[PDB]
Design a protein around this ligand. Structure first.
Ligand SMILES: Cc1cc2nc3c(=O)[nH]c(=O)nc-3n(C[C@H](O)[C@H](O)[C@H](O)COP(=O)(O)O)c2cc1C
Ligand SMILES: Cc1cc2nc3c(=O)[nH]c(=O)nc-3n(C[C@H](O)[C@H](O)[C@H](O)COP(=O)(O)O)c2cc1C
Ligand SMILES: O=C(O)c1cc(=O)[nH]c(=O)[nH]1
Ligand SMILES: O=C(O)c1cc(=O)[nH]c(=O)[nH]1
Ligand SMILES: [Cl-]
Ligand SMILES: [Cl-]
Ligand SMILES: [Cl-]
Ligand SMILES: [Cl-]
Ligand SMILES: [Cl-]
Ligand SMILES: [Cl-]
Ligand SMILES: [Cl-]
Lengths: 314, 314
């Protein structure tokens, strides 16, 4: 007998699967579809105070090895997602995360001030996005450590709940250490989601001699097969460095076996982006079955048995 | 009539292709084989003052979508590659680049002082490596802008020739801007090689529940198909921001079409890493034939006709 149950943040989850923020979670229809799905949870589209129409199209392209996008935080605005969390979402079915991506610290502070009461009353969980690489003129906050600390301090002052942070990928141990040091100063940061896309790739089509997305001269965030080893590295790097926290994996998940790798690396929840974008929410039924099959073959009955237990050779 | 000829740095190259500095270039056998091959050029293994055995083996793993390695700068030491450049290399056949990766500025200055005479007398060309992601306790210098400026000042002061720099990938426009600003301070930096590996990825084998390389708990640099969009982005970002310099592309080249994409992005020379590691030096016969096939289809006669002319949709 086997179980995909996960218990964290004073919630029970049927399985570790959810959408990545930004995928299939922008509209009422999207959010109801995610809640009706076999996923263990869901997160709403990264929001800004005001509605944003996003960058000009084409701004997404599916590729053999994944995806490239420069959406530009298209979203219905904070009021819309707050209302969903406050009044609409079926918490009897599954827990809800709300992704927030204010364009300034002050914007995040004002949104969190209002979110706090809905968190208390309804149990929505904040995922604060420190890593959006597609708003022109605005670098990833988590690539400026002083800015990241400033943001976390300001939010912690006004948001008296456990919350998580969505991180951009890092590529060296000095940065893993610096980032972990900052996050470890905030006991209220109870989870870390690794990773947002690999930022500012450039896909060029040989036939047309052209980039494949319109905004930002074709530069956009990479997802899918391109990012799995980077995602696993970041998941494991923070798993090792942040023993007091949960790690959520995001990046490169197409199968239950990919999910198995994220959990081995340290993941508690597993988010699905590009694959969900191309398959839709039916994907969750397949991922749960596939993960259970992998576990069956290996003789694992629960996720606790192998989470973080990636074997090293040195 | 068509031509792959490239003229730069007071040399003529038969075609844009060469090896990447970690691959097929450590031993005399390697270097002679690269010289006998169809490549336009070659670069010797990134060197340190003393011979280095490198990180514990096994430390390179070929993957379906590219490679991961934590080599640790294994090399025969500067004297060995300097001797090759001074005494042995057939400059009648093609130009030679020498990759240098001192573990401190002092080490780079010491080697450059000695390299200067052989550059003068034989015409070997320096590629200064600011981007090695595999030496434990040693972060990428190019990820610390102050350190990078200091290194370039110290090297420029002692080395009376043009040279180039091998860069790690960047992932946001603020970093492209800052890095380009620094490089633009140094008129002796006449080429920029983009990119070194995507650092500190983590591959996990689901079957064995294990990392696939021994050093650094399985963390190593990614090469091959994983890195093409990141490589193109960096090539193009520096092509745009450093109009007074040449860009060399490195990353994800397996075919003439991949090379065509690098050239469209702005590459002058195109370096081949993982694909060469797996195919060997005969690869250059295929790549040149393939790139001429792409040009023929499109009615291009020379690389100058399309270098840097990637089309945007904005
Ligand atoms: C279309 C699209 C929109 C995205 N927008 C957001 C966003 O709103 N907030 C966020 O944290 N990440 C967003 N991202 C990043 C994803 O959450 C995820 O981190 C990334 O795509 C990697 O997962 P994957 O390899 O499964 O795609 C977006 C990704 C895609 C494909
Ligand atoms: C086994 C191996 C060793 C490498 N060692 C070096 C090095 O000595 N110096 C360097 O600049 N790059 C080194 N690299 C990085 C490559 O030069 C290149 O930047 C990277 O592999 C991307 O090219 P690819 O996608 O064609 O592999 C090494 C790569 C490999 C696979
Ligand atoms: O909507 C976007 O532009 C976006 C946000 C984000 O956080 N990540 C991403 O790849 N795109
Ligand atoms: O030999 C290595 O460690 C090595 C050096 C380098 O510069 N890049 C890389 O991926 N490996
Ligand atoms: Cl689109
Ligand atoms: Cl598409
Ligand atoms: Cl609902
Ligand atoms: Cl090996
Ligand atoms: Cl020779
Ligand atoms: Cl000669
Ligand atoms: Cl290659």
């Amino acid at each position: 007998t086997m179980s995909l149950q996960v218990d964290l943040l004073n919630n029970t989850f049927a399985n570790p699967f959810m959408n990545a923020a930004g995928v299939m979670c922008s509209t009422t229809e999207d959010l109801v579809a995610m809640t009706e799905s076999a996923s263990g949870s869901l997160v709403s589209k990264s929001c800004t105070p005001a509605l944003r129409e996003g960058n000009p199209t084409p701004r997404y392209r599916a590729l053999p090895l994944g995806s490239i996008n420069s959406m530009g935080l298209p979203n219905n605005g904070f009021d819309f997602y707050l209302a969903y969390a406050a009044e609409q979402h079926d918490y009897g079915r599954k827990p809800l995360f709300l992704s927030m991506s204010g364009l300034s610290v002050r914007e995040n502070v004002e949104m969190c001030k209002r979110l706090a009461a809905v968190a208390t009353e309804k149990g929505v969980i904040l995922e604060l996005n420190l890593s959006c690489p597609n708003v022109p003129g605005k670098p990833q906050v988590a690539y400026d450590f002083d800015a990241m600390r400033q943001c976390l301090t300001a939010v912690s002052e006004v948001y008296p709940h456990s919350f998580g942070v969505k991180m951009p990928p890092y590529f060296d141990f000095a940065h893993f250490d610096a980032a972990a040091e900052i996050l470890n100063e905030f006991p209220q940061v109870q989870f870390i989601t690794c990773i947002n896309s690999i930022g500012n790739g450039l896909v060029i089509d040989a036939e047309t001699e052209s980039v494949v997305i319109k905004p930002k001269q074709g530069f956009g965030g990479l997802g899918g097969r391109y990012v799995l080893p980077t995602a696993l590295a970041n998941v494991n790097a923070f798993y090792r460095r942040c023993p007091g926290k949960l790690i959520f994996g995001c990046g490169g998940v197409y199968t239950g076996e990919d999910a198995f790798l994220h959990v081995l690396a340290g993941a508690s929840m597993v988010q699905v982006g590009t694959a969900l974008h191309e398959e839709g929410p039916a994907i969750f039924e397949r991922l749960t079955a596939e993960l259970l099959d992998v576990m069956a073959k290996k003789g694992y009955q629960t996720l606790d048995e192998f989470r973080g237990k990636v074997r090293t050779l040195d």
